[PDB]
Amino acid sequence: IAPITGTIKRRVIMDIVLGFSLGGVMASYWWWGFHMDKINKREKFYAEL
Amino acid sequence: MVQRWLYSTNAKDIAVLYFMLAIFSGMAGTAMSLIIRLELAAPGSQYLHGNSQLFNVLVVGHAVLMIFFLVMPALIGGFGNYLLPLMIGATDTAFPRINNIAFWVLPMGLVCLVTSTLVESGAGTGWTVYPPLSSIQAHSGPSVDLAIFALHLTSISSLLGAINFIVTTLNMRTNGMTMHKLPLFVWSIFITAFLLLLSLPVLSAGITMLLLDRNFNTSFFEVSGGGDPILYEHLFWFFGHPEVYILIIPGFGIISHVVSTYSKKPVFGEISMVYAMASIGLLGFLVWSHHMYIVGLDADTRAYFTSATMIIAIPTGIKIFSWLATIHGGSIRLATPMLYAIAFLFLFTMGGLTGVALANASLDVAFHDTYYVVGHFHYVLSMGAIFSLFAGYYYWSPQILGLNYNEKLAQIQFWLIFIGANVIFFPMHFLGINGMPRRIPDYPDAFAGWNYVASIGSFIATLSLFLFIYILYDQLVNGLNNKVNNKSVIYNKAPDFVESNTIFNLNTVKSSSIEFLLTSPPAVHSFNTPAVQS
Amino acid sequence: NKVIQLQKIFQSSTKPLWWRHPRSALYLYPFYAIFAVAVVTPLLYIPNAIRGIKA
Amino acid sequence: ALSNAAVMDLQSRWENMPSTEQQDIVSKLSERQKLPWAQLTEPEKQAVWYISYGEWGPRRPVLNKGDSSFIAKGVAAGLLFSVGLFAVVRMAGGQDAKTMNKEWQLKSDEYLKSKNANPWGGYSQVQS
Amino acid sequence: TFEEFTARYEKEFDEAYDLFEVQRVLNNCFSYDLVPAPAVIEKALRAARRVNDLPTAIRVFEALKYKVENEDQYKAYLDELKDVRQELGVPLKEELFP
Amino acid sequence: WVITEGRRLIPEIFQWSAVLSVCLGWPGAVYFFSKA
Ligand code: HEA
Ligand code: HEA
Ligand SMILES: [Ca+2]
Numbered sequence: 001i002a003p004i005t006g007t008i009k010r011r012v013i014m015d016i017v018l019g020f021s022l023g024g025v026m027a028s029y030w031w032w033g034f035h036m037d038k039i040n041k042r043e044k045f046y047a048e049l
Numbered sequence: 050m051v052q053r054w055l056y057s058t059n060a061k062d063i064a065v066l067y068f069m070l071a072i073f074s075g076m077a078g079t080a081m082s083l084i085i086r087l088e089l090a091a092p093g094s095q096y097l098h099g100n101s102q103l104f105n106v107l108v109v110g111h112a113v114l115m116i117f118f119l120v121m122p123a124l125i126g127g128f129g130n131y132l133l134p135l136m137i138g139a140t141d142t143a144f145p146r147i148n149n150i151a152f153w154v155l156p157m158g159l160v161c162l163v164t165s166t167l168v169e170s171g172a173g174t175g176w177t178v179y180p181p182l183s184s185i186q187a188h189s190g191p192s193v194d195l196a197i198f199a200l201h202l203t204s205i206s207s208l209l210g211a212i213n214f215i216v217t218t219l220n221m222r223t224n225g226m227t228m229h230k231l232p233l234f235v236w237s238i239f240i241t242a243f244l245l246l247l248s249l250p251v252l253s254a255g256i257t258m259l260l261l262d263r264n265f266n267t268s269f270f271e272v273s274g275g276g277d278p279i280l281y282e283h284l285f286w287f288f289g290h291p292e293v294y295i296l297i298i299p300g301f302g303i304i305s306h307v308v309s310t311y312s313k314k315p316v317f318g319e320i321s322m323v324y325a326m327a328s329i330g331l332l333g334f335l336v337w338s339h340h341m342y343i344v345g346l347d348a349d350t351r352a353y354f355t356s357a358t359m360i361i362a363i364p365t366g367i368k369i370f371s372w373l374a375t376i377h378g379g380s381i382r383l384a385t386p387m388l389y390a391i392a393f394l395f396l397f398t399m400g401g402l403t404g405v406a407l408a409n410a411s412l413d414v415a416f417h418d419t420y421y422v423v424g425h426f427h428y429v430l431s432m433g434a435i436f437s438l439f440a441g442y443y444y445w446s447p448q449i450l451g452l453n454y455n456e457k458l459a460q461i462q463f464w465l466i467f468i469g470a471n472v473i474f475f476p477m478h479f480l481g482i483n484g485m486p487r488r489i490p491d492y493p494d495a496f497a498g499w500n501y502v503a504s505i506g507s508f509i510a511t512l513s514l515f516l517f518i519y520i521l522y523d524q525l526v527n528g529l530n531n532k533v534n535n536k537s538v539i540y541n542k543a544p545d546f547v548e549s550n551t552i553f554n555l556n557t558v559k560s561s562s563i564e565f566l567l568t569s570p571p572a573v574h575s576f577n578t579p580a581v582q583s
Numbered sequence: 584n585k586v587i588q589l590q591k592i593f594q595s596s597t598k599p600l601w602w603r604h605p606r607s608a609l610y611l612y613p614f615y616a617i618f619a620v621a622v623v624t625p626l627l628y629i630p631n632a633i634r635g636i637k638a
Numbered sequence: 639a640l641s642n643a644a645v646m647d648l649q650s651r652w653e654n655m656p657s658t659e660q661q662d663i664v665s666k667l668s669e670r671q672k673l674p675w676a677q678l679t680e681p682e683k684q685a686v687w688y689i690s691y692g693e694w695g696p697r698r699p700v701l702n703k704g705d706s707s708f709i710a711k712g713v714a715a716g717l718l719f720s721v722g723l724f725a726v727v728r729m730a731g732g733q734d735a736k737t738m739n740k741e742w743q744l745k746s747d748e749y750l751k752s753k754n755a756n757p758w759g760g761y762s763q764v765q766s
Numbered sequence: 767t768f769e770e771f772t773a774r775y776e777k778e779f780d781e782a783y784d785l786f787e788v789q790r791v792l793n794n795c796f797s798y799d800l801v802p803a804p805a806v807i808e809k810a811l812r813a814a815r816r817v818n819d820l821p822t823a824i825r826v827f828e829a830l831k832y833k834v835e836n837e838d839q840y841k842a843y844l845d846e847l848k849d850v851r852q853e854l855g856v857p858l859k860e861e862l863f864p
Numbered sequence: 865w866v867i868t869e870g871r872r873l874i875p876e877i878f879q880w881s882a883v884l885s886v887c888l889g890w891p892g893a894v895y896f897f898s899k900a
């Protein structure tokens with residue numbers, strides 16, 4: 001009989017790990033999807049200047 | 050009878066009076082918000098003809114009625130007076146006769162406020178009554194004088210109430226209740242009373258300085274005479290930032306108690322919870338001038354106030370995580386108080402992130418005196434303190450009154466207020482980032498977009514309030530029939546997995562406070578022989 | 584001194600505490616007459632102030 | 639054993655059942671359990687479980703079967719009434735500003751476009 | 767430790783003098799993070815027979831089915847406990863169809 | 865543990881992305897439907 005233990009422990013770990021990973025994409029899409037797009041269109045008008 | 054209500058000494062009757070005054074002022078103050086939203090629905094003066102006065106006056110009345118006449122008498126005077134003696138185990142308060150004057154000086158303030166509004170001038174100065182605009186040359190009537198007198202009455206009520214709670218907690222506990230072993234709500238009330246005691250006198254000094262300067266010719270803040278209108282800002286906000294914590298700390302105890310009863314597991318790390326609760330109160334006295342970033346302070350003091358205000362997030366975050374850790378493993382019961390608590394956990398964290406975003410002095414030069422700040426503090430006030438007030442009512446009312454409230458008709462109210470308030474207060478952050486200022490009755494046309502959406506959402510919340518009033522009526526009338534039919538839920542804790550239905554009916558309440566063991570409604574003389582703990 | 588004989592009077596009186604002393608009638612009756620004038624006279628000037636007539 | 643009529647289908651029969659009548663069944667059920675099992679009748683084993691662990695008295699759910707749909711319809715009705723009542727009160731209001739004509743808003747753009755109002759982003763000023 | 771855990775609830779169940787205590791101990795044994803060993807469950811079955819409560823013995827496997835978290839480990843507990851369960855007479859929930 | 869956790873975890877992330885997109889992305893509906 002396998003001593004099933006710590007089901008909560010790793011379930012806790014994955015929950016916290018996913019939260020940072022899912023929050024990682026949310027944070028990363030803001031920086032490199034939206035915010036980085038804003039900088040490039042900003043620089044183009046200044047580049048023509 | 051006159052003797053029972055005019056000569057009250059019983060603390061529970063004073064709590065009922067505090068509650069009754071809170072709802073009337075709550076309805077009065079939430080109609081001015083309706084008129085404000087109707088005036089801001091579209092560009093141009095639509096309902097109020099052209100009067101810029103009677104708009105600022107309505108805003109002042111709304112703010113004062115919501116803060117000093119709804120939240121203060123309900124959370125502190127309503128719940129604190131009724132529940133602190135019962136959970137501690139005291140039969141009543143230490144000073145039972147000044148507990149009555151702590152209440153009866155509140156209706157006088159309402160008379161002073163209404164007669165201030167009815168005088169031809171009015172008080173269009175904001176809830177922060179700044180000296181030069183509210184001086185005798187710009188506000189020349191007896192209006193703001195009467196408004197100041199109301200603040201003195203509320204201050205004396207709060208001070209005499211705060212002195213009562215400190216002595217009551219310190220030496221009226223039962224035979225086993227060491228100061229180390231207290232319910233968290235009592236801890237919140239204790240810390241709130243200590244903040245009030247140390248913060249009220251400075252407000253009284255500043256307000257009396259303003260009064261004497263208007264009528265007694267003292268160059269306290271008059272520019273011609275060496276006075277400084279910025280000294281008033283220091284004096285007022287020294288009571289001002291600590292104040293935003295008197296209105297949320299008793300809101301923390303309610304959430305702490307709610308989430309550990311409908312989730313059948315005790316709070317994760319209680320001693321750290323009380324440490325964090327005390328640290329927020331202690332350290333909030335060191336951050337008051339973040340409300341004065343653009344007033345022209347030194348560069349080095351701005352760095353200090355920026356560094357000290359971010360430390361607030363360290364204990365606060367501890368409370369957010371420890372609330373998410375006491376619900377991880379337990380069994381969750383999705384009732385109305387639990388739905389309010391779960392909504393609070395999300396909306397208050399949304400408000401706090403915007404708050405930490407506002408805490409940086411270098412960024413606040415773009416977000417100050419805009420609707421960004423309004424959207425911020427309407428999350429922690431209208432969704433952080435109001436929600437815990439609704440959760441506390443739905444949590445304790447059947448025990449206090451003895452009348453149930455038709456669950457399915459209350460969850461509708463919860464959803465309506467949720468999706469109504471989110472509509473009012475989420476678009477504000479969009480209006481604030483484009484630079485829409487505060488305290489204006491009419492705005493440039495380009496701002497007409499989100500204002501219409503926010504105005505539509507106010508009617509939803511007003512309808513939810515009307516439904517709540519009907520719920521009150523249906524609770525007081527034929528409320529004894531609600532627990533006979535299947536309209537309401539009777540037990541706040543379902544039996545455990547291996548607990549039979551015939552054994553749950555000999556141990557009905559497994560609670561960690563004396564409140565839910567008392568008869569419904571509690572007796573006038575609750576404790577003859579003192580209760581014993583541990 | 585008189586405390587012992589005043590103790591026996593205040594206890595076993597079955598009257599409100601402000602009416603127990605035999606000399607209390609001298610303070611209470613003139614007080615309610617002046618008190619009524621104090622809390623009713625300012626309420627008469629309220630409508631006069633709302634209209635704006637200064638006396 | 640116990641009479642066949644009483645035990646059979648003692649689930650839908652638990653509610654709408656006299657209190658004194660249902661207190662006699664548990665007295666009989668208790669005595670027959672103090673006897674070696676595998677001798678109990680099948681109707682009884684489904685009866686003792688339901689009384690102990692059924693959905694009656696306590697363990698009744700927070701919401702009944704039809705309550706979830708009632709709350710959904712009630713919430714949607716509240717949104718309809720709020721929006722409908724919003725338009726009625728809007729009729730008893732003042733006239734619009736003279737600058738919301740969509741020809742004022744079109745003319746606002748020529749001023750902005752000549753001054754180069756927004757290089758990244760727009761200056762459309764049109765919301766008619 | 768797990769062996770200390772098993773040997774101390776093996777003693778708690780042997781001392782349970784009423785139907786309130788048996789339902790109190792089993793609510794403690796299944797309240798821990800670890801799934802109990804099959805030696806623990808056997809003693810719990812004996813306790814229910816001692817206080818004469820059939821429905822709590824049925825809920826033992828119902829508690830285990832949600833607790834064991836594996837479809838083969840429930841069969842693993844099933845096989846070793848066939849002799850004691852059949853001897854006692856406890857029916858499973860699926861077999862009972864209540 | 866990979867077999868058991870997969871049956872429950874991955875569907876929830878998809879449900880997760882839906883609700884959060886509703887609470888936060890609702891004003892995008894009003895602007896598109898008729899910014900007009
Ligand atoms: C109950 C009321 C309440 C509460 C609780 C707060 C809480 C906070 N408030 Fe404030 N505030 C007001 C009511 C409140 N406030 C009002 C009414 C005004 C305007 C008054 C006026 O001008 O008229 C105001 C204005 C105001 C200003 C001045 C803005 C200006 O006028 O320009 C600032 C400046 O920093 C501020 C910051 C904060 C911070 C940092 C917190 C912190 O306590 C928040 C901390 C929260 C979090 C940190 C999120 C939760 C924590 C976590 C999720 C853990 C993870 C966190 C991190 C990793 C950081 N708010
Ligand atoms: C507790 C404090 C509180 C509450 C509840 C509210 C509730 C609301 N407020 Fe606000 N408001 C302030 C405190 C509050 N407010 C302050 C301090 C200012 C600054 C004033 C100034 O600039 O000088 C302000 C300013 C302010 C403005 C900006 C004015 C300006 O800057 O010019 C607006 C704009 O729409 C607004 C609207 C609303 C609306 C629509 C509601 C409500 O419709 C939102 C939904 C809430 C309810 C409907 C209340 C429900 C609860 C009850 C009625 C109590 C009964 C319930 C129980 C006992 C459980 N108020
Ligand atoms: Ca208008």
Ligand SMILES: [Cu+2]
Nearest residue numbers: 289290291293
């Ligand atoms: Cu502050």
